[PDB]
């Protein structure tokens, strides 16, 4: 009876979502003029990493950036002067994520050791010191995001997400609705709510304050590796291993547009938006990053010039440039 | 055209670059091996003989540093982390030999280990990575094979009930699973109570992989 009730409710939600799909964004955006093809040129090339890059995050001043690699090193760079600001040696080399504080005081890093280590960048002694190590997860950490100085939401491979505070060290909130390993997180600009992507071909919209799931998106055929909020905060885009990106709405609670091409069969490792949201940059497994446009959904450019799988990318908070890290041990800046 | 503070920052960056270069040169000279195997096989016993999230064990034998990584604890999806370990000298693979007739609810434990062996061996990340197969228990298998025939484990088996024939047969069955014989050679050893023999065999296999890597680096091969 319970399974039958679940089936009839799922049918009801399916019909109600089809009752609001009278129009499509593909035909609405027909009238707008096509943007000129975005031909970017590498303004900087950062050298000093020896192993592969796993994550990057921009600072709030659009000048500092962090990168993590399998030589045990987390390196903070100045992009303008193409030099190194900090080099932090990690206790566990198998790091899979990094995050930068909105205040710029702290960095976090998680890995296979099921521990999220937090480092303080502004000490009186002048050396980087680990602040707090969080070990409450039974699975490898996939992502971490700083809500603020004192709160940090983390994502882990044990089919759950956890919101922690750093002063006490206890998990303040627990988010458990996924049936597969959870791969990614993205925060709203106003920090009210966050989205999570997992290995069950679904993405969930949670709530920070009450601590309960708000929405559930089930439209993919393969697992979701990348998630990013739209800058307005009322939509998001996905990225999966079946060579397609999909645009979901927090309001319509369903898919809006599909970014796919016939000659692409490779996996999508990272997704990021432009400041206006007009462009959508997607890092593929074909050794190049393709730039699409959100509205029309045709290709607007290509960023080639990497020697191995592109694993991460990010646009600055003011949108002046975009950095791409990859498995070739390099980190490039395009504009 | 450069201020004093900017020049000092460039000097600091050069010092960081020098320290990173020294750390990279130190890091390159150490041999890292993943330790795979089923749970009840007895990997911990092999670790204790040679000596939460990730277990790293480092030992020095014949002026060559070895770091051993143990991924057994994590019960998550194995594909998601099977690509960070792409660069690796060899894969130790420990299989219990005395569980041919044991049934754990898969019909046979031996199939539960051959499945893992097939999954790891026929992988894109480890096309050329060598595999070092250890049969963990020999005396208990001898006592069992005396007390119980192997005809239950394998539908079709030869007449010879001798321990050597059964050992050879199991070894051939594990070696058969490799579908690319030329690129990767699997080394099969019999675990004994002598630590020196096992460490020496691992050292010889690692030495052969180092010989292959040197041949690739020079370009002669």
């Amino acid at each position: 009876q319970l399974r039958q009730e679940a089936e009839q409710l799922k049918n009801q939600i399916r019909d109600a979502r089809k009752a609001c799909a009278d129009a499509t964004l593909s035909q609405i955006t027909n009238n707008i003029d096509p943007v000129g093809r975005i031909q970017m040129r590498t303004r900087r090339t950062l050298r000093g990493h020896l192993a592969k890059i796993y994550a990057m995050h921009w600072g709030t001043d659009s000048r500092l950036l962090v990168s993590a690699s399998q030589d045990g090193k987390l390196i903070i760079w100045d992009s303008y002067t193409t030099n190194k600001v900090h080099a932090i040696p990690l206790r566990s080399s198998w790091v899979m994520t990094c995050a930068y504080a909105p205040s710029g005081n702290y960095v976090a890093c998680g890995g296979l050791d099921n521990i999220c280590s937090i480092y303080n960048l502004k000490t009186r002694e002048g050396n980087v010191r680990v602040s707090r190590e969080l070990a409450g997860h039974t699975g490898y950490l996939s992502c971490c995001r700083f809500l603020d100085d004192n709160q940090i939401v983390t994502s882990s491979g044990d089919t759950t997400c956890a919101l922690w505070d750093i002063e006490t060290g206890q998990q303040t909130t627990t988010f458990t609705g996924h049936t597969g390993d959870v791969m990614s997180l993205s925060l709203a600009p106003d920090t009210r709510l966050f989205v999570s992507g997992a290995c069950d071909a679904s993405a969930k919209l949670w709530d920070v304050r009450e601590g309960m799931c708000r929405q559930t998106f089930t439209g993919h055929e393969s697992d979701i590796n990348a998630i990013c909020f739209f800058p307005n905060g009322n939509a998001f885009a996905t990225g999966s291993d079946d060579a397609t990106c999909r645009l979901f709405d927090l309001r319509a609670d369903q898919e809006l547009m599909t970014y796919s091409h016939d000659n692409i069969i490779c996996g999508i490792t990272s997704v990021s938006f432009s400041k206006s949201g007009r462009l959508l940059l997607a890092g593929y497994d074909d050794f190049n990053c393709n730039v699409w446009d959100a509205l029309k959904a045709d290709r607007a450019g290509v960023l080639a010039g990497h020697d191995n799988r592109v694993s991460c990318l990010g646009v600055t908070d003011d949108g002046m440039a975009v950095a791409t890290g990859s498995w070739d041990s390099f980190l490039k800046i395009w504009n | 055209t450069l201020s004093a503070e900017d020049k000092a920052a460039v000097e600091r960056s050069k010092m960081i670059d020098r320290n990173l270069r020294e750390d990279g040169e130190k890091a390159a000279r150490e041999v890292k091996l993943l330790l795979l195997g089923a749970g009840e096989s007895g990997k911990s016993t092999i670790v204790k003989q040679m000596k939460t999230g990730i277990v790293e064990t480092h030992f020095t034998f014949k002026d060559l540093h070895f770091k051993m990584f143990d991924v057994g604890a994590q019960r998550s999806e194995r594909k998601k982390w099977i690509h960070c370990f792409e660069g690796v000298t060899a894969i130790i693979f420990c299989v219990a030999l005395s569980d041919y007739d044991l049934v754990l609810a898969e019909m046979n434990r031996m199939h539960e280990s051959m499945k893992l062996f097939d999954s790891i061996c026929n992988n894109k990340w480890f096309t050329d990575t060598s595999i070092i197969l250890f049969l963990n228990k020999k005396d208990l298998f001898e006592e069992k094979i005396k007390k119980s025939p192997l005809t239950i484990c394998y539908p079709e088996y030869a007449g010879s009930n001798t321990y050597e024939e059964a050992a050879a047969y199991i070894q051939c069955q594990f070696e058969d699973l490799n579908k690319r014989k030329d690129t990767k050679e699997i080394y099969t050893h019999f675990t004994c109570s002598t630590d020196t023999k096992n460490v020496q065999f691992v050292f010889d296999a690692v030495t052969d992989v180092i010989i292959k890597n040197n041949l690739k680096d020079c370009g002669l091969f």
Partner: single-chain antibody
Amino acid sequence: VQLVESGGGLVQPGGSRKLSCSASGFAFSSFGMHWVRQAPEKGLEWVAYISSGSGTIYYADTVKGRFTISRDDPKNTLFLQMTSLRSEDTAMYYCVRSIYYYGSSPFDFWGQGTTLTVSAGSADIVMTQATSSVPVTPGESVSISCRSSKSLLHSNGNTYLYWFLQRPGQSPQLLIYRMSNLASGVPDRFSGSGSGTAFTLTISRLEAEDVGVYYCMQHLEYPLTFGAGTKLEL
């Protein structure tokens, strides 16, 4: 964070002496170090600087050659060797830690200082303060102005002006670095402002502890010339 100076004593002219600075509680290996001298009736004067790793060493023009500076990183000790001492070299010496990178605050910690008593540049920016003393009362705001003989506004947008307070019988303290950012451990009352050569520090709602000499400093070019010093009074 402690710096302890030693090796200072009264000497006859022509003697040779070694100064030793003992850094404790912090990472002395990655910090560039300065020696700065203060005359009894004159302002603070920079003497020398050694960078991290001893890559670049700079000296004042007057004391160039004769004074030599060395640093020992494992023992965390700074040595200054002084030879051919004269009448002019009768000052109070400060050992100063400074680290240079983007967003850093140099000259954050100032040493206690030792005393040396002797029983006897055209390209330099002449930093000039128009006032020697401002008598005021606690509670009311005060503005003290510093002026430069060369534009400190570099191409990158930074204006290398540093504000220091020296209470009587105390070490100097950094208030504002690069004439914009308030330094740590300093209340929000102090504020630096100004355009080009013109520079105005403002101290709203003055309190009893604000009494002391104020020094403006430039950092545009290597012979660092300090200011005369505005002795604020009650």
